[PDB]
Symmetry: C2
Subunit: 294 residues, 2 copies
Amino acid sequence: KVKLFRASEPILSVLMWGVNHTINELSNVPVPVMLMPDDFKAYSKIKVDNHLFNKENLPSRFKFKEYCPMVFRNLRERFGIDDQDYQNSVTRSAPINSDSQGRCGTRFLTTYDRRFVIKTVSSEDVAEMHNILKKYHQFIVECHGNTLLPQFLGMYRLTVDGVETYMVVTRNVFSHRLTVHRKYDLKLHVGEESKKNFLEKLKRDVEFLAQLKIMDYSLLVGIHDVDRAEQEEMEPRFFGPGEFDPSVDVYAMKSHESSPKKEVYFMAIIDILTPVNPEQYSKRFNEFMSNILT
Amino acid sequence: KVKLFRASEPILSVLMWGVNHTINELSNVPVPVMLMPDDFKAYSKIKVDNHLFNKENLPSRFKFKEYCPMVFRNLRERFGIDDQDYQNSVTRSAPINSDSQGRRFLTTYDRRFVIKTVSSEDVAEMHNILKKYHQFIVECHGNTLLPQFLGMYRLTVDGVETYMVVTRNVFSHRLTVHRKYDLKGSDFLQKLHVGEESKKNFLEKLKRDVEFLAQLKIMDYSLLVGIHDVDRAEQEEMEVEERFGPGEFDPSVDVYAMKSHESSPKKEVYFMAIIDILTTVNPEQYSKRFNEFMSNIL
């Protein structure tokens, strides 16, 4: 386990090195019983300036900034994400580019094992996250990690060559192994406990957003076509036809059994940082997607 | 697992963080075939500015420079010191005041390593001698009486630069030293009686060790002598442990240590080393005087 943080772009090695640095750093700060308010204003900044040392993959000079490290450690736990697992996802191999999953980010990436999405964002995106973080953390507590909201894992600032780049890490709305064949953006037939739980969450989530005074978020719907997933292959964890681990792929619903094609759907609220009144937007949102299901 | 770096003074917490960091960081850079010229001029530098985070033992703002990581990493291999032991001795618990020291030094909690605070000039002088010293440590296979250098750092904490060199303790990490002698310019000469194996070996080391310092044009260094009085240890500090025998030592751990002769006055352990390698007769003369001088104690 000699970790070369090797990537196609310098910026990605720096990311891989920072996540490795900050997670190790945190493995030495005790897990508190509660988070204090200080933790939401907090950060760690680290400037590196190597000289003739360890420069075969990293640049010789970079900064790395981790926003609110104690809070995102907690959120990781509440989302059932073990820190060492996060660390390995970002560090074992370089993050590889991904298709967009929102209007929010300027560049979308995935970790080699397709678990976590990494989004390049603006400084005002960083600041809006800081604005919503305590209530969001509160919300994630009250709801036990069971949202359709983006589930935030990390937030960073990297400087390479005097160029600053902000990044947010989330769990992938899509699968880590089933391909999403079609994405729909909404500003489908399932099981009844699925529909019930979906609409439970959706009301609870949309309510939250309205109370933060947020509008113009959308619903990302992705679709996995099983018959096509067989067919695009003809010419190690098991899994059958349209099967998935729901603790990993937490936005996935399988299509109803007595229903046409076997499909898997991925539904999540996206675009909560950058962008009728919000309460009105909330009520409309509920009702729009109530009709759309089963 | 869960290093808190609790030290009395923040410099020592920064030292413990720094070594932990730089050794970790080093496990991710591969052990190379050969040290290249740049390795003798390389360094690593890291600035930490934590805000309302991890302020428990660490300060918020601190900097940590390690000189020639790749030379000192190899040097440790050459001296039979695994990086994880090194990391362990420095990080498992705070470094502490040395029972002896200089004009004062630190030791790792386990008494295995000495950390001396030095000056900018010492740092510079070490940079001068380093390639040559490395060549030397290769040929002599880590079998020296010279200071065995393990790492070199500059910590900045609370506005203040501190340079540090880390060495293998001259003395035993377990056996008390009751009598110290320091043999300087042209001193405290009872003569020391050691085994045939031990005396033959010692004289062989000093021969090439003094040759080395000479060729580098280094003079004005001293021979440090420590004596562990075994019978005195058995009396004075009898059941200290419960509240290796009574003067028995691990040769791979205590590399300067020698046993008193089978047919000898009393039971004794000797520790002898050349010290003051960094900061007018000629050096080849000083070399010669020395080899001659320090052989006749035995």
